[PDB]
Structures are given as C-alpha cells and as structure tokens.
Amino acid sequence: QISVRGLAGVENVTELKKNFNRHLHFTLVKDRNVATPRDYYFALAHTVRDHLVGRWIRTQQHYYEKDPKRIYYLSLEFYMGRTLQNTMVNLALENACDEATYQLGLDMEELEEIEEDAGLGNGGLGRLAACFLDSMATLGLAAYGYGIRYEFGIFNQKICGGWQMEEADDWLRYGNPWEKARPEFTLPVHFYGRVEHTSQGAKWVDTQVVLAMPYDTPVPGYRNNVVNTMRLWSAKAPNDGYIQAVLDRNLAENISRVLYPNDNFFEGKELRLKQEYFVVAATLQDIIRRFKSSTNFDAFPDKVAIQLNDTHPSLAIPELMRVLVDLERLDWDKAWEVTVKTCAYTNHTVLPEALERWPVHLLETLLPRHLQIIYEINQRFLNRVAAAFPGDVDRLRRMSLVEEGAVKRINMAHLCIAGSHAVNGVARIHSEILKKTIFKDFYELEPHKFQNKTNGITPRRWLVLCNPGLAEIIAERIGEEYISDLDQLRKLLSYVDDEAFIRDVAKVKQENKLKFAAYLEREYKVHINPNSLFDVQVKRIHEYKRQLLNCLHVITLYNRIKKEPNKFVVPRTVMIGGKAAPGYHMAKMIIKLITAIGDVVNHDPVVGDRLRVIFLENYRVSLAEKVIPAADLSEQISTAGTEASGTGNMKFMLNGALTIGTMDGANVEMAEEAGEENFFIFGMRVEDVDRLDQRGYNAQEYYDRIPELRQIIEQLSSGFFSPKQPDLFKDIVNMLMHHDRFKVFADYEEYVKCQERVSALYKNPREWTRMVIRNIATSGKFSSDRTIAQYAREIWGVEPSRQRLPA
Amino acid sequence: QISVRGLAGVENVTELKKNFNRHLHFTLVKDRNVATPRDYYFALAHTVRDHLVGRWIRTQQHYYEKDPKRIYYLSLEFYMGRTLQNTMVNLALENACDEATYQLGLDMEELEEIEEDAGLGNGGLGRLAACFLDSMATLGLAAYGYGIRYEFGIFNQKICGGWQMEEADDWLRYGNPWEKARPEFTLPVHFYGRVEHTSQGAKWVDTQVVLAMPYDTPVPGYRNNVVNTMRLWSAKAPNDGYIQAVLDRNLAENISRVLYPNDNFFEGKELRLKQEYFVVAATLQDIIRRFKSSTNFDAFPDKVAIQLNDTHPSLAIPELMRVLVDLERLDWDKAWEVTVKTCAYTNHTVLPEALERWPVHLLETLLPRHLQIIYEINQRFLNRVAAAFPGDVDRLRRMSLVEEGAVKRINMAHLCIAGSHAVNGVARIHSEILKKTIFKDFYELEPHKFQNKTNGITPRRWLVLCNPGLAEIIAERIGEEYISDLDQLRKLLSYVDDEAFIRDVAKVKQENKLKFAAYLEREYKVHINPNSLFDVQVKRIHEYKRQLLNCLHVITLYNRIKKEPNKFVVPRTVMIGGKAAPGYHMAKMIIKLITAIGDVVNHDPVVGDRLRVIFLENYRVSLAEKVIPAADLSEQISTAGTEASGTGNMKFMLNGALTIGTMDGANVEMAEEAGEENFFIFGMRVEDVDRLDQRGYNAQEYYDRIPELRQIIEQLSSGFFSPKQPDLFKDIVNMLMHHDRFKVFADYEEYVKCQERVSALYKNPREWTRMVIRNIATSGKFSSDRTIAQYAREIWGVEPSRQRLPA
C-alpha cells in the first residue's frame, strides 16, 4: 500500500467487506460458489457507490439551501472512461478497498479491468468535458454536466488484415451501476410542426413529441465531500396496424441511440441535428424549472451560466429566446439581454471542414420557429454592424449568420458569438488565431467578448490514478497537497540534482514500461523490448495530426539500418494508436500503412530488436491510462496552426515523457513553461506556414532535393510495403505529392534531425531523466483546476472553493 | 597584486630597481630628467632580459651535454606580438616588476603599451607557430624556431574615409632589445647558376651568393627555467660604377625586407620563392652543422626532426637531398630514406587559391639543381604508384608533383607528402577532409602517413597574460597547476551552481568590458555602451570567413528596429576587425561596407544606444589580447569545410565568451567538448554544402523567398548605405547574387534565428554565465601544450618533460 492511496483502517476494511458480501448476495443474487470476476466487480462497484450517495444527497441539498449561481456545461460528448478507481481515489478508499478485497481473496486490479469504458465521446473535446466536471466538483462549484446518454458510444476498433473494423460499443450490456434513472423528471421535446401567428404572440403547433428521460451520474470532487451531477438524457416515445405502431416507437428513440463517431468533422445529417436540439430543449426546461424554484428573469443571469462546448449545443441561444419570448412573454430586447449574459461559447478548432453550417431547408422543416428567431437575431445583429462600419457591405456579408449560395446555410459559430457575452479559444496561440483570422470581424465589433482559456487535464485521473508510483515518489518529497494544487510540482526543481530522486523517477518509468510491455503480450500477443525508447503517438487518426510524418521517420530509420546494419542505433518501439472515423477513407488508409510498415520492419532479421512498429488497437481512455505512464517520447507533430490545443500532450508531460513537437496549440505554452531547451521543438511556425501558402506549396521540390525522402516515396509506390497489392498506397502517395493540405514533406528534414537529437539524449540516462524532471516540475499550469478557476472568475462570475463539505 | 602574478619579494624588488636605474644610465645613456616613457620601457625590457640570459646559456649548454633529439620548426611566419609581459609571466616576475616600477613612480601597464608588436605573421598560421614555440619550451623539448627576420612585418592598417590604407610596419625603428645578432654564424645561400655533370657527381656552379645572418631571440618556458631559441635569418650582401655597385647591394638584401601580407592566398612571385629557399638553405646548413658536432647520416633522423609549417618551406626536402647526395655523396636511396624520416608536413587549408604551385620556368632559373632533384623524386614516386595501381593512368596524372598545362607547375603539397613520413591536418574535420578529397590518392597509397593534430593556443598569453582577473578567480578555486595543465579546468564544472563563482565570472567579464570600452575612447575616440552584448568577429578579412553574413545580420537588426522602434531588443555592440590583403579587392570592399553600415546605424536617433557597429582598426596580437577578454559573443561563421581549424575561436572560449558558429574546423571539437547545448551552432554542415553544389547553388532562390533578405539587397543596390555613391556596393551585390563561392544566403535564415536565441539567453544573466562556465571548464583540450605533446609523441618521437632546470 502506498500513502497517496489513503488509510486502510480496521473499522472501514471490515465495513467494506460486509457490504461487499451483502451486495453479492442481495444485489447480484449470487453466492461465492457461482460468482464470476464480473459479479465481484459489480459487488465492489455497488459497495463504493454506497459511499457516494450520502454525499450526493447532501451536496444537492446544500445547493438548494445556499442557492449559489449554477453552472451548466452543455456538451454532446462526455468521454468519462471507467468510474470505479476514480471514485475510490476521490473518496480516499483505494487502499481500504484494496485491503478488503485482498482479505476476501480477490485482486482488485483484476476487477477494475472488467469495468466497461463510458465512451460517450470521440477524443479531445469529449475528454475535456470529463476533466472539467472533475475539476468543477473539486473546486466546489455548483455545476451540472448535461448531455445525451448514448446507447452506443464510440465504436470498438478491431484490426483485421491490418484494416480497421468497427463494432458496436454496447457498453450498457451488463448494466451501469453508476447511473440513477430519474423517470419522474421526464420532459417533452418538440420537433417539426409549424408556426402560427396569433394576436398575442407566435405559437409552435402540430409538433411531434419525443420524451427526454434523465439519468443522473455522480461526479465526486477530490476529497472535499462534494458530489455534483452529470445528467444525460435518453429518448423515449410517448405511449400514444397496432403491431407496427408499437415497433415504430424506435424511430423516436433512435435520437439517443448512437454517438456520431466524427472528431473535428461536420456531417450535416438530420439525426445529428435532432440530437443537438434534444439535449438543448430538455436541458433548458430543466434549468428554468430549477430557477423558478429558487418571476423577473432579470436575475436569471445572476443564477445561471450556460457554457456551450463548441457549437453543437448552439441552438440553446434561439431556444432560450423562444422560451422567454413565446412562453414567458418577455419583450425581445429584454430576452436578448438575458440570453447574452447567460451564454458563453468555447471554440475548439479553425479547420473549415469542422465548423457547423446547417442547411436552411433542414432547420426550416425540423425547427420552423427557431429559424425565424435566427433570422431576427441576424437582422438585428447586422444592423449593429452596419451602424458601426457604415458602407462596409462586404463585412455585412462575411458576418451574416446566414450564408448565401448554392444552398443557404446557418453558420452556427456566428450565431454563438452574437448570442454570447464571452467567446474563448483553448490555447493562447489558438485564441490569437481566432482574433487575427476566423473571427477577425467579430473581434473588431466586440473586442471585449474574446478570451483565452488554455486547456488542462485532471491530475487525479492523469497522475494519481494511472501513475501511482510517480505520485508516490513525488508525495514523499513535497507532500500530497499538489494533487489539488498542481503548481506545487515546481518544488521538484530543487531535486533536479538529487541523485536519489533521479534514480526513483527513472525507476518508476522502467516499472511502467515493464508493466505495459507485459500487458501487450497478455491481452494482445505482442512482444517488445522494455529497454528501447518508447516512442508513442496516440490520438485520433487525422491528416492534420500527421501520423504520416511519423511513418516517414519510421521508414527512414528502417532504411538507415538496412543501409548500415552493423552500426549502433538507439533501440525504439514506435507505438501509434487511434481510431479513424468510419467514413474517413484517408484515415483508414493511414492505419493500413502503419500496420503494413510493421509487417515489414518487425520481421526483418537484420533489424532485430532495434526497431519495432506497433499499432495500438482500440485506443480509448482506459488504454491511455496504460500507455501514457509508459511513454518516453510524446509525438505532438500537427502542422503549426491546426491543433487548437491538444490535451494528450499535457498527459505525457505530467507522466515523465519528453515531447517532440511543433509550435502548435498548447505545445507552445508547455515549452514556455519548461524552457525550450527542455523540449524537442522543430518545424515551421504558423508564420512559416502562411509564407509557404503565399508562395504556393509544391511537394515535388522536397522530393527532388531530399534523396532519403525520394527513396521512401518510391518504396511506397513500387509496393515494397504491399507486395500482393503493389498500388495499394497509390492514394497516399498521390495525396502527399499533389494535394497535401498539411505540408508533411515541408517538416520532414527538421523532424528527422530533431529525432536524432532525441536519440542522442536517450543514450545519456541521467541527463534524459533530469530533463524529464524539469518537464514534470513545470506541468502545473496544465491542470484543469487552473483552467476551471479561470472560467469561473473571468466568465461565469463565481469563486472556486476548496472547502470540505461535512461528512 | 594578484597571486598568479608571483611574489614581490623584498630582495628582488630592490635588485630590479637598481638594475633598472643601471640600464637607464649606462644602457640608454639618460637621466631621470630627460627620460621619456619609451626610455623607461627600454630600461625595464633590458632589466627583464638580464634574467633570461643565465637560463638561456644554461639551457643550450644542457642540450649540448645531453644531446637530445632536436626539433626544428620551419615557418615563414612567427606572429609573436609583444615580449615584455610574456617574459615576466614565464619567469614569475610580474608582481616584482609591478612593485619595483611602482616604487620608482612608474605605471608598468603604461610602459608595456609602448612595446611594438613583433608582427612577423599574417594570422592563424603565424600565431600558431608562436603558440607552439611557447608550448615546446614549456614542455622541455630541445626545439628551435627558424624563420626570416623581416624588416617590415604585417602592415599597420589605417581607416580613411572608411577605406583601408596600408603603411609600413617599421617595428625595428627604436631597436629590438629581445634579439641578439650572431654575425659570427653567418652562412652563404646560393641562387641561379647552372648545373654541371662531372664524372663523380653533379655540381651547382656560377651561382649568385647572398649571406644569411642569424638573430637569436629567447623563448622562455613557463616557470621551468627552460629558454629555447627562435633563430631568424637576415639577408646580407657579400662585400665583393663604384657608387652604383654599393647601392645595388640592396637587391640582395631585399630578400628579408618585407613579409608578404597574404593569408591563405598564393602569389607566385619570385621574391617570395627567394624568401622560401633562403630560410630553408640557411637553416639546413645550421642543422647539419649542429649535427656533425654532436659521419653516418643513418642516425640523422634519430637526432633531427624537421617540421614544415605548410608548404612554404617545402624546398627543405630537395635541399636536404641536394646536400646529402651532391655534397655528402650518399647514394640516392640512402639519402631519400633519411629525408623522409626527418621531415613532417602540416597542411593548413584546402582552398585551391592557397596551395603553392610554382611555375617550372621560375624554379628552372632560380634553382636549377633543385628542379632536377624534384623531377627525379617525382619519377621514382610515380613508379611506386604505377606498381601499386597498375594501369590507373589517371591516378598517375593526379598524383604527379608536376602539373601539366598552359604552364607547367610544381605542386609543392604533393612534394611534401612524398618526402615526409607524416602529414597532418589541424582539426579532426579538416584532417578527414584531406583523406576524403584533396589527398585521397595519397592516403590510399600510404595511409600510415596521415594524422590529425588539432590546433591549440597557449594559456599563458591567452589567459594569464591577457585576462589576469579570470585566471585569479579560477586559481582561487583550483590552484595554479592548470596554467601548464589546462585539462584541470574541468574541476570548474563543480562550481557551475556556485553562486559566488557565478558572480565572480560575471564580474570579471564586466570589468574587462569597462576596461575595453574605455580603451576605445582613449586611443581612438569612440563611445560604446558597456551594458550591451559585445558581439565580435576579429580575424583576417576573407570571403570564406563570411564577415558579409555578419553584416547581413547587423542590417537585419537595424531594419527590425526601424520597423518597430518602441519594441525592446537586447542592446548590442557589434565589433568587426581584421586586415585585408592589399590586392584583395573584395576584402577591401567588405571593410568599406562595414564602416558604411556603422555610419548609418551609429547616427540614427531612433536606434539610440541599442545598436552600435564598430570596425576595430589595425587588428593584431596586442589588440586581440584586449578585445577577446571583453567579448560576450564569438563569431566563427565560416562556410562549413573552409576554415581548416581556426584558433581565435579557442581564445574566445577560454576567455568567457559564448560561441555562435558553423560546424567547421575546430568549432566541431569545441562543441563536442562543451556539449552542443552550450554552443550556438547553425547552418549547413559539410554534407549539406556538397548537396547544394551537386544541385547547383542559386542565390536568387533565397532572395525570392526571404522578404527581409530582399530588403537588404535592395538597400545596398539603391545606395541606402552610400548616398553620394549609389552604386558603390554593386560589386558586392553582384557577387552575392551570381558568384558567391561561399553560400552566404544559404545560411542567412538559420543564422538570424540562432542570433535570436543568443539574445534570449543574454536576457538571463545567471544562465548565460552558467553556460559560460561550462565552456571555460571544457576548453582544456585546446591548449597548445596538448597539441605539442601529440606532435612530440606521434610524429617527432620525443617525450615532453615538465621538469624544472636548475636556476
């Protein structure tokens, strides 16, 4: 047992054991003679859950009595991962439960692996919402996460013949012990219909009704006895030939059936629009209901803050207006004032293919009243623009919420800026780019609205939970206060020359690598050398993230070895993992390329154990918790200006891996905090990318001047990596040579050179670890607690608290 | 008084004072009432000189008794600089003399400034010979420096209208107290004539005779009581209408009149050839004379080692053969064996315009016998090549000592390789380049001959003498042993975190900068800001050294300031100094450009004291001793592969300045010793340069893709820096754009970026100094004591000794 894992008191261990047996008997209806590991997992989950209830009920009762300003975080994604360990950590029950299960003759680690990941998200945006809920609870904010309870989350990825195969993520199959259905709070949501203009106001009639049933999941703060709520809505058909009518109920319930598996890509499908309005409509009614139970809505913004995670829940703006104007009968101007002061919008990308632009004909059929409200909002907004910039007709066209052309569309991002009192980017460089390019016109009109809130990650799940060994050696030196005040890691700088510490940090990493190297053989049949440098790139597969650049390097290393076999080179295990969106052809071709390279490299006798290429299958939160602690090198090589922030980069930094990356997103602030000398930065900066675009990017030029690059392209083209199918990678080569939007070749030389400097430092164990300590010691700024404290003070207008609520 | 400067004993101070007064009276024939500072300088010089005599006579007597192997270093250049302080340092008389002169009411520092530099050299090659003599004496080797006593050394440089003006360096005007004329050892040297082939051997007859009169100068080792000799020959006409015949004696004496002012450039003038044979002929007779007084010449190589400093003294090979064969009557094969085992050759450059290729018609008229011997050597050599590489006729052509064509020439470098048992480069990268390119054929034939001997500098003149403050704070921590065992500076690494040391190192530098900033106003009328970063590039003006790249950066800094005047930038004083060879037009245009930039930059009100451009006039050894200790940034930016070694770079490193440079010459080994992280490396490596040449260097490409570079070129072309003469710099621009052999534009971007990282570190005083300490601490390898110990053991076959000879 380690200190950070809490006390294993005699009274508590005894209590846990009896409650465990009580649940196994009464709850699971089983006896030790027929119970399986899954049954044991559930008995434990129910036991731990019992400890949350008391705090959950009192926290909510507390908010009712004190009536603080409530924070509503609306998101279509909450990438939660597993809940058992995180709950034990936040309640300081980990050692007690470890001990109790030990005494019952069970291995708690084994049971934890049985829990299904709650994969209600795609990647960064979804996991950010999850980290935020943890921090909001840890900072004592009266916050509520609101989203959709998808029956099927992100698909489970299977690799067949080196190709990605998708299969339904039936995460609710065995039940979810963490959620509590609240059928009594079911609310109606309207679709279609038409608008009627009577004497006293407009009415939305003849609508199709879909019920929204909420499921509440507890969100415990870190050892402060605060337990907030994440409310997820489930679609249900109202109860009102016969057989077919009953079977068609599934049409309405399909709304909460599956999570769209696109990350950073907009797909204008009706079902997706229905999901977006569904979460918005149910949530707002719940918000208003709670408010009226605290009617002049003038105080609404003083009691309510609604944070829009990207534009997905943007309909909250016109829906709030609809309710205040049509139902509460407030005048437009009063309603608009309340709406703007209540809403805030967070942008997460600048890529054009990711911005939401809904066809007017769709909103026209599905939400006729909202379209009218949007036109009105647009009308009044453009009048403000016209008055501020008289005669600038092109500005009017550029700022309009309505986009003209082949098919009229509504720019949801413009709608969010107009209807929010605050708009923020997620990293300094990203926020600046927003003001300089994408939202320049809006920034000129209302400079005060634009802010920055650099992303962060929770040190609970991303350090204590996944890397106990590191959290322990750190605690031994500076105590445990850093877990909820990560800035204290700075105190570790005074140990950079401490021989003992250096030895421990290195030891922890080695243990993590052995543990992971073992895991890889266990549940996947792959052997790797634990002494090699663990070079990993895990994140969704996308061209802008440039897994292809990583591939080029790997192939370069291979060609160099084959060129001079008996020459020494630092051993490396190159691990790449991530899912590709089902309809993203190029993403799927890249995965194939990666496995294809592995097929060649991993079986070349001459390479030996000096180079290994492994594709990490089904990358997800639970897997991230395993690979990150075991990494030595973190690949964050997106083309400068494309990765808004990135969060995986922060996880790696906090866990003892060095970073090789471009000056993109949060990498810039990370390098700034640790010192550029302690980072492996390379490639074009944003400015260099623009210059190249002015000039015109011609990949052929690099192909002609770099022999090693040429050799690689010719290997791909000739079928060196695809014997049976010589032209298998023709699309990739064609893209790289003629239409590479991300300039892979432009950063190749500097990337390869930078990688050489990495290998050089790895040869000096002591100095590599010392640099590691300098990174870990300055990763404090990247805690989501800092991020949330900034949102709270600069946007929501509430003060975070570290005060413990009574037991 | 500081410790490293020795003891100021009461008996010695009293003795020095009386001897000072004795010389002022009896030697200078003056009294205190009419004595000027110069008279005082001479009284002091004679007093210090008296202390050398006893040791000088005993050292030579010692070599006579013990009869060790003698080392003869032949060089046409010995860039000695001043001798007074160096002598006091090596005899540990500095404090005593400081005290004694103080008591007589005189400032010793003032008197030292009166001594004329012995400028018998151009640059690096000449100063290397000087450092070598110091180290050979310090290592107790029986070594003799042999050269020419030029009446006029390197010209004194005057800047008029921003242009270089040359004026005779009449360094002997007031007399040289250090030398001792030895008219009794005068030797005859022959020129012209013809060859007669009699029965028993060939005879060189009807020659013109020129006498060689030697002047001996003492070379004291560091506190070991060893005093070696530097013998310099002076040309004298034999004593045998009347008036004109007497006046024409000057024709013969013109041989030792002036030093050719070319550095790294071959000028095939007859007078230069006469100088080369003159030093060789007189020296060899002296060597043989001394040997016969120690006749089977089989032991000659066991008692004699002749080191050829470049090809300038290459005629030593055929001259030795001439003497052994024609005069001593040894058979050719025996004579050749002795010659090869006796001679060793050091190459100092790979630039084609620097290699000596003498026209056959000149050697034919001036040295008919030597030409015959050279043909014979060539003949027998090519027979060896033919036998080793049968049928390779092109190799025969490439290796021939005789070059065919428009005008037959003799490749002196090929002659040296054939007639020497050892050939060495002066830095690892240079030595490798010799084996891979320039002398590849020779390396293949005789791989054993090729070696490397990385250059070094003497820590006596280049640390103790010019930077007493630094030598003192170092001695305070690790003692004084490092002065003759520089590797001990490593011990300073354990003080890199020592707050006291950091403060002292920084303090010493600040004092040096104040001292120099003051000097600049004193004897030159220029004011500078002592708080700015001292950015200096001092060395001979040449295109390969790329002072032009430095200029481009300076202009860039200026344009950036003018662009954003109120933006903060680290203040800089950019100092550039160096002489241009009289006939090197481009070199003279670069000097003009530098002063022209200064004229604009230094008088722009907006720049203020943030940027200053100063051209250091008349750069020479005595000036180097002043600027180097005061530098913060050392510019060593030659195009990769062109600077064989460089030595100025080492001086700066030993004196606390950081280095920004290319991976050229010794810079590579310096970075390797200190760690690349503690060096500011940038630009193309040798390999990148070759790739560019394969491809074809097109400067226009850089001009088109870099706006800042374009702006600079257009400023130069339009006359921005030359109002009255708008096209004044047309030649420079034309060269840069169409025929730049050194690829200035190719390294511009990376250079400017690297300079930004320098400015960034300078903003952090503590970390800049810590990096400085890491440099100084690892500069040990660059002591000429290490270099000479390697020559001694690996080439000359003698063991260095640190044993003190009796008083």
Ligand SMILES: OC[C@H]1O[C@@H](c2cc(O)ccc2O)[C@H](O)[C@@H](O)[C@@H]1O
């Ligand atoms: O802000 C959390 C992360 O959100 C990511 C994201 C943005 C979207 O518009 C859609 C999906 C998605 O995962 C950005 O790519 C990351 O850079 C950023 O760190």
Ligand SMILES: OC[C@H]1O[C@@H](c2cc(O)ccc2O)[C@H](O)[C@@H](O)[C@@H]1O
């Ligand atoms: O070896 C001492 C230095 O000799 C220099 C030199 C070489 C020549 O062939 C002629 C003159 C001259 O000064 C090289 O340029 C330096 O790189 C080298 O460090």
Ligand SMILES: *Cc1c(COP(=O)(O)O)cnc(C)c1O
């Ligand atoms: C942290 C995380 C991400 C975000 O990673 P980036 O590299 O910033 O894209 C995506 N997926 C999972 C499962 C994560 O844990």
Ligand SMILES: *Cc1c(COP(=O)(O)O)cnc(C)c1O
């Ligand atoms: C050391 C020295 C040199 C050689 O300098 P580099 O930069 O190596 O060319 C030339 N001249 C003088 C006066 C020197 O002291």
